[PDB]
């Protein structure tokens, strides 16, 4: 089971970029796909996540409608298209998985709606 | 949503230190908490699901427990590889998994 | 229903049984037109369209006599449902009038249940692995515990969230189990809504369920 | 298969399908008229003519264009299989021939398997207390464990019998589970049948299978 | 769960003999049903089992041809016809139940092949 | 087949007292070993089954251990309710189950 994310660099304020981050070892169609970032000295911070149930795609209030998450099964890798990138999106991205909750059986052996596996993360930069 | 940690914490090694979260009735007294540790230079590492289980792998050192809006994290026989970033999490009524501000450990 | 009997044909007219793809869960009859099941049998929100609803059946997806079959209009999920931690875990089911709007037809085996010795009963696992559902509906009779029981650290915790119950032995032995959910509860009115559990039949884990009495309100708004 | 992958295609060739009544397990093809499977798939010993083979499948009861279904002939339990303690737990089946006395076609996806980096495959449960099957094939990697690791009082005692063998981690996490009875273990050659274990990746818990190596002599024997 | 044994009584020696065991509080279809015998001041002997996986029927060799065991699913109910009863068959017989093995797991949950409930015993005398 | 066993066996209240099972390579060695306890006048008791499992309800202190063609029972924290008749129990080879001598366990 491994991440590995990548397209993180050096942007002007107000450009864009896009992420990428390519599974391994594991099913890249039973779990949930989020972006973490870890601005420079600061706390994690939640920016998106993908088939959620009941839900579809939620985003973050600071990223919504400049972030878009999207998924290529067959390719078994996860998207992150960051426009209108402001000052303060500079931050380490991660990519990470959590498996989702189906029935009636919790059992100690699988770890629900909790970020188990993550991966090394990337660097974005936005400065002028 | 948003929850509220100690910024830092301090402990000699063997020792036992409490990291503490507190929450709203949103997030931490309507559903699971979660906890993570985080080396420098490092990803973030699961600790704690479901307010008191831990992953495999994880020693039996490290315990959680919920009561109420609050939660808390506690580490017995502290050792010098315990010196961490520890974060918080839940998820808020739209889902939205949500961090806490992070709790510097040192091992004194 | 681990730790269950077989029924009998005429015992529970109000369970309802729903199809979509390979998957399977139960339901309650509370109206001619409505079926409560579990939030999470349709989390993953398939199309109304592609759910089959089976009302005065016996033998899991074996035609009957007096087994109905009808189409779903739509869903409602209830709107603060978490899949994170299965509180609020109800849903409404509207099934499809005909052309003289008569959606199911009362009969001896096809009867809804009442609103607010409890019973349990679906066509779950009748063992803790068990490869198969059950072909036959089995019925359980499991005790109503207290909320201070269940709020134990030792039984469930802090798991436990306002609109949840127990119901079954702190020694294990009968309780629901996985292929139950939506399935009723009856002390007959509805009393729970199969929701949740950790195990089949654990020594202080007791199934969790929907306390229909706490959601009244909603179901009455939502069912006019 | 918990804590597998979903395998390619062309990737076990070998596997087969086993359907009758509301029942299912799998298989593996040694030759083009014969399947090795488990004995206890067959312990209540149903008629051969309610025997269907699916060789060439990917998803589990879909029609593909490489699926190749076939009828049996006959079967043949191990004459020691002991269903108290699942001892020499493997079975013949005999694939019945057409009009030219040809049973299974070999093709890329159609191709026995030999007879004496170990995997495992199947369509059984992805999670310990899963609800369905595996859609799609999966497989896993497993290491071959030592009989002294096999018989050690906290890993599995006195329950390995002569015929048995380990495979999997004693840390717990991939091995087979509920549904995978009779598949393959690979090495190729076929060096181990899915016979049983207690649970689905515990911890001191890997899965049993049956030696292939040890029942060489009867394969040849009752193959013939 | 409760198994309840009848039809026991003093019979001439070379005389015939039903016995019947009513069980309720489980499903009479899941389970092997066996009768085991009692001699006074001796230990216990198996006698007779159904629904043996391989097998059809199991006799003991001291009754082989002369007693049948059967069983009335529907009446959720065990026989045993004792036939050419000689007098070393004094007993009080016993009714029981085991659990068969299924599939690939086995849980602590549930006893195989284990004799975890049995009747009251019912007393067979065959005497001149 | 056939099991042996020890016509009986003695102990004190606290202590701990062995019933052993003796038998062959088509029951024992071949298959798992049971217990059965019988109290006069009652039916027996289930109290090991596959040779170290107990079922709810039979305390702790009763263990089965099996090696090879030989099985054994321990009874520890002897008490005077333990005063019982002990059988071992097996399935030949055509399965069809098997039963020892028993073993008179006293009391004293
Ligand atoms: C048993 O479960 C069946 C579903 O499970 C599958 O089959 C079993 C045997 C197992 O193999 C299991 O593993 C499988 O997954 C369930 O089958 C359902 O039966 C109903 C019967 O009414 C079907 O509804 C009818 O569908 C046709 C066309 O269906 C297509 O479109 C739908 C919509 O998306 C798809 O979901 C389907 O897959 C098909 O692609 C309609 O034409 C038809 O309309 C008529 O009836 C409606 C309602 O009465 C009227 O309003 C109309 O005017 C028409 O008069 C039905 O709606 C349903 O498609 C089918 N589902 C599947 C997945 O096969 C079966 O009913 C269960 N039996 C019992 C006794 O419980
Ligand atoms: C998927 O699994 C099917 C079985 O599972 C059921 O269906 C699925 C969809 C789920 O709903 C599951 O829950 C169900 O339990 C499996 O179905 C099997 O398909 C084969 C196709 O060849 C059938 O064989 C044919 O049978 C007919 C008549 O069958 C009757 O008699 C048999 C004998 O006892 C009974 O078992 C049946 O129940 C019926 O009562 C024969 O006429 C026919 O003969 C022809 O073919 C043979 C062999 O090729 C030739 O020798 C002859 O000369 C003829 O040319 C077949 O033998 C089988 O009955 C059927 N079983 C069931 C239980 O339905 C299906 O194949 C699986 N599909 C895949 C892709 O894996």
Redesign the pocket.
């Given at each position: 089971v491994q991440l590995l994310e990548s397209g993180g660099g050096l942007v002007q304020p107000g450009g864009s970029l896009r992420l990428s981050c390519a599974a391994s070892g594991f099913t890249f169609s039973k779990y949930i796909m989020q972006w973490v970032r870890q601005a420079p000295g600061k706390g994690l911070e939640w920016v998106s996540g993908i088939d959620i149930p009941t839900k579809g795609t939620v985003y973050a209030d600071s990223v919504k409608g400049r972030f878009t998450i999207s998924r290529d099964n067959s390719k078994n890798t996860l998207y992150l298209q960051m426009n209108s990138l402001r000052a303060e999106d500079t931050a380490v991205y991660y990519c990470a998985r959590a498996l989702p909750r189906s029935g009636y059986l919790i059992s100690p052996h699988y770890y629900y709606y909790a970020l188990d596996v993550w991966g090394q993360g990337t660097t974005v930069t936005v400065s002028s | 949503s948003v929850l509220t940690q100690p910024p830092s914490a301090s402990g000699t090694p063997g020792q036992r230190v409490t990291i503490s979260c507190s929450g709203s009735s949103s997030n931490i007294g309507r559903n699971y908490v979660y906890w993570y540790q985080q080396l420098p230079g490092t990803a973030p590492k699961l600790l704690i699901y479901s307010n008191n289980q831990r992953p495999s792998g994880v020693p039996d050192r490290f315990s959680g427990s919920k009561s109420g809006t609050s939660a808390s994290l506690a580490i017995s026989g502290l050792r010098s590889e315990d010196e961490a970033d520890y974060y918080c999490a839940a998820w808020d009524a739209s889902l939205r998994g949500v961090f806490g501000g992070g709790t510097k450990l040192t091992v004194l | 229903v681990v730790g269950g009997l077989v029924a009998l044909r005429g015992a529970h007219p109000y369970i309802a049984?729903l199809?979509?793809?390979?998957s399977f869960c139960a339901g309650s009859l509370i109206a001619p037109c409505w079926v409560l099941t579990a939030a999470h049998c349709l989390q993953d929100r398939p199309?109304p369209?592609?759910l089959?609803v089976?009302l005065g059946?016996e033998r899991r997806?074996?035609?009957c006599e007096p087994?109905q079959?009808?189409?779903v209009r739509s869903y409602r999920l209830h709107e603060a449902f978490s899949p994170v931690s299965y509180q609020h875990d109800l849903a409404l089911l509207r099934l499809?009038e005909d052309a003289d709007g008569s959606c199911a037809l009362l009969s001896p085996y096809v009867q809804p249940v009442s609103l607010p010795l409890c019973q349990v009963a679906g066509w779950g696992h009748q063992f803790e692995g068990a490869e198969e559902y059950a072909s036959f509906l089995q019925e359980a009779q499991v005790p109503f515990l207290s909320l201070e029981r269940c709020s134990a650290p030792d039984v469930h915790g802090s798991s436990i969230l306002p609109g949840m119950l127990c119901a079954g032995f702190l020694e294990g032995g009968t309780d629901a189990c996985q292929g139950d959910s939506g399935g009723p509860l009856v002390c007959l009115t509805l009393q729970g809504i199969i929701s949740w559990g950790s195990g089949c039949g654990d020594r202080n884990k007791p199934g969790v369920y929907t306390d229909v009495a706490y959601y009244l309100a909603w179901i009455r708004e939502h069912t006019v």
């Open positions: - | - | 049984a199809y979509w793809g390979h199309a369209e592609d089959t089976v059946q997806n074996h035609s087994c079959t009808l189409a499809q």
